[PDB]
Amino acid sequence: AENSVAYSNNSIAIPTNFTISVTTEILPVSMTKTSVDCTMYICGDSTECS
Amino acid sequence: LTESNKKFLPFQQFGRDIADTTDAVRDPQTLEILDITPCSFGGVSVITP
Amino acid sequence: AYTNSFTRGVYYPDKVFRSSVLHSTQDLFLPFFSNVTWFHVIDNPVLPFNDGVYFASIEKSNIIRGWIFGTTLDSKTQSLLIVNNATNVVIKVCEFQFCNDPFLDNCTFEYVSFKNLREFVFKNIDGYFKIYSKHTPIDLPQGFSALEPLVDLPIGINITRFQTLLALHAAYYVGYLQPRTFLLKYNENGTITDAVDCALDPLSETKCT
Numbered sequence: 001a002e003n004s005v006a007y008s009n010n011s012i013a014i015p016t017n018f019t020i021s022v023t024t025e026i027l028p029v030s031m032t033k034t035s036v037d038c039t040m041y042i043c044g045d046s047t048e049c050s
Numbered sequence: 051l052t053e054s055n056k057k058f059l060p061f062q063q064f065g066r067d068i069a070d071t072t073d074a075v076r077d078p079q080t081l082e083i084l085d086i087t088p089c090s091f092g093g094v095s096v097i098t099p
Numbered sequence: 100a101y102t103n104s105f106t107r108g109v110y111y112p113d114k115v116f117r118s119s120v121l122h123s124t125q126d127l128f129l130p131f132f133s134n135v136t137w138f139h140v141i142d143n144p145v146l147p148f149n150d151g152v153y154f155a156s157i158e159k160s161n162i163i164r165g166w167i168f169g170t171t172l173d174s175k176t177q178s179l180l181i182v183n184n185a186t187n188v189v190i191k192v193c194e195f196q197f198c199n200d201p202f203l204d205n206c207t208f209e210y211v212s213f214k215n216l217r218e219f220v221f222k223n224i225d226g227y228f229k230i231y232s233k234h235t236p237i238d239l240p241q242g243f244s245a246l247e248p249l250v251d252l253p254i255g256i257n258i259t260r261f262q263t264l265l266a267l268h269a270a271y272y273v274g275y276l277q278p279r280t281f282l283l284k285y286n287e288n289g290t291i292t293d294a295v296d297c298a299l300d301p302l303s304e305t306k307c308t
């Protein structure tokens with residue numbers, strides 16, 4: 001939305017009331033831990049491929 | 051090969067896995083369904099000082 | 100005449116059991132919402148075979164009894180023949196032409212086995228004749244039915260044309276298969292419950308992607 005602050009060199013704007021806002025912030029920390037095997041993934045139950 | 055309980059359709063012969071690998075078979079003499087599992091897992095963890 | 104296919108003609112592409120997956124496979128399928136030729140029986144013209152035939156039939160007393168296949172069909176080369184004489188099913192590949200028997204008051208291969216809708220898919224792949232079928236108690240109805248394989252034969256002869264056989268004392272539909280990619284939904288019991296034709300509209304292309 002277009003706004004225009006009414007600026008002049010003798011006028012100020014002071015709040016007379018307030019509000020208390022509780023906002024939410026979501027942050028990732030860790031991810032899934034995985035582990036791999038060579039022979040079970042690549043060949044798998046194969047002696048000559050191992 | 052292990053005894054299984056999968057509900058194969060009468061025209062179906064093999065069952066396929068997520069990796070499109072053969073997971074279940076049908077024995078051509080006795081029409082039963084057998085699951086295929088790996089031999090043995092090799093990765094064990096060793097906790098030592 | 101012509102009529103809409105209405106998402107029919109989906110068969111089982113192989114003998115593989117899959118449970119609760121979405122599988123994208125490319126094979127000879129009937130395209131969705133396509134034109135199929137409608138013939139009415141109160142005529143059996145000679146029609147080509149192309150890459151495969153989806154043959155649907157709406158009947159109540161099994162007027163259509165079988166089909167004849169071949170390239171020339173004039174007792175010159177091998178001509179396949181499927182005949183159901185209401186007791187058993189006879190498969191022949193002999194050259195001899197037989198007239199249709201009214202039901203009022205040399206070859207080396209031979210095999211002996213509106214309320215109804217019978218759907219069949221015939222295709223000849225690497226010299227093997229494959230017949231898939233599905234019979235259901237009922238333009239084609241707009242429902243999804245999976246065609247299970249029944250007949251596999253090592254025939255070998257090329258087939259370029261075909262013709263149906265009527266029990267001359269009901270209607271049928273003929274469509275042609277095309278190489279298409281289909282996304283099939285296998286449920287918990289290995290039954291194809293729904294399918295998506297990947298080259299129909301951009302929404303189904305997005306679904307297949």
Ligand SMILES: *[C@@H]1O[C@H](CO)[C@@H](O[C@@H]2O[C@H](CO)[C@@H](O[C@@H]3O[C@H](CO[C@H]4O[C@H](CO)[C@@H](O)[C@H](O)[C@@H]4O)[C@@H](O)[C@H](O[C@H]4O[C@H](CO)[C@@H](O)[C@H](O)[C@@H]4O)[C@@H]3O)[C@H](O)[C@H]2NC(C)=O)[C@H](O)[C@H]1NC(C)=O
Binds near residue numbers: 016017018
């Ligand atoms: C500075 O700002 C604060 C809050 O922003 C003001 O303090 C009080 O604010 C409350 C809430 O507005 C006033 O209480 C009553 O609000 C009712 C509306 O309730 C709805 O909105 C609130 C959230 O604002 C929801 O929690 C609620 O569930 C409702 O959805 C009005 O209907 C009330 O009016 C009734 O009482 C007055 C008397 O107070 C009568 O004159 C009316 O006719 C009617 O019967 C009421 O307004 C509370 O009144 C405010 N306090 C005071 C002292 O006014 C401050 O007022 C504000 N300014 C300053 C200088 O601090």
Ligand SMILES: *[C@@H]1O[C@H](CO)[C@@H](O[C@@H]2O[C@H](CO)[C@@H](O[C@@H]3O[C@H](CO)[C@@H](O)[C@H](O)[C@@H]3O)[C@H](O)[C@H]2NC(C)=O)[C@H](O)[C@H]1NC(C)=O
Binds near residue numbers: 080081
């Ligand atoms: C393949 O051939 C084998 C034969 O080696 C067939 O197995 C046979 O199946 C029949 C099924 O009726 C068995 O008969 C019954 O078996 C039960 C349980 O054993 C018994 O209680 C009955 O009294 C009766 O004998 C038969 O025993 C069995 N034979 C063997 C050696 O297992 C098998 O069915 C054939 N498979 C196909 C697909 O053709």
Ligand SMILES: *[C@@H]1O[C@H](CO)[C@@H](O[C@@H]2O[C@H](CO)[C@@H](O[C@@H]3O[C@H](CO)[C@@H](O)[C@H](O)[C@@H]3O)[C@H](O)[C@H]2NC(C)=O)[C@H](O)[C@H]1NC(C)=O
Binds near residue numbers: 186
């Ligand atoms: C309709 O078609 C059927 C299918 O051919 C005809 O029935 C008879 O089917 C048998 C299938 O077993 C054919 O084979 C013969 O069987 C006998 C006994 O089983 C056997 O001893 C023979 O050696 C041979 O294998 C049989 O040829 C066939 N009968 C005829 C006359 O061809 C049936 O006749 C057809 N017509 C009607 C009106 O049902």
Ligand SMILES: *[C@@H]1O[C@H](CO)[C@@H](O[C@@H]2O[C@H](CO)[C@@H](O[C@@H]3O[C@H](CO)[C@@H](O)[C@H](O)[C@@H]3O)[C@H](O)[C@H]2NC(C)=O)[C@H](O)[C@H]1NC(C)=O
Binds near residue numbers: 286288
């Ligand atoms: C896959 O097929 C199996 C069949 O082995 C389904 O399991 C059972 O299916 C029946 C319906 O056919 C469910 O209803 C039950 O029917 C019986 C017989 O009519 C009736 O006596 C029971 O009171 C009940 O109504 C049954 O709950 C179900 N059982 C289980 C454990 O699932 C299975 O539902 C099929 N899965 C699909 C279609 O996803």
Ligand SMILES: *[C@@H]1O[C@H](CO)[C@@H](O[C@@H]2O[C@H](CO)[C@@H](O)[C@H](O)[C@H]2NC(C)=O)[C@H](O)[C@H]1NC(C)=O
Binds near residue numbers: 176193206207
């Ligand atoms: C009909 O019978 C004849 C004779 O049995 C078949 O002829 C084949 O002829 C070629 C060359 O002349 C031979 O090499 C083949 O061995 C013959 N076939 C057999 C089975 O012996 C002819 O193909 C037969 N036609 C049909 C449609 O069966």
Ligand SMILES: *[C@@H]1O[C@H](CO)[C@@H](O)[C@H](O)[C@H]1NC(C)=O
Binds near residue numbers: 100
């Ligand atoms: C398909 O069928 C419709 C309706 O019968 C017809 O207008 C159209 O020309 C047909 N298209 C082809 C390619 O046969």
Ligand SMILES: *[C@@H]1O[C@H](CO)[C@@H](O)[C@H](O)[C@H]1NC(C)=O
Binds near residue numbers: 255256257
């Ligand atoms: C089918 O056609 C191909 C190419 O036209 C030919 O090589 C083949 O021999 C034919 N099949 C038979 C059984 O004659």
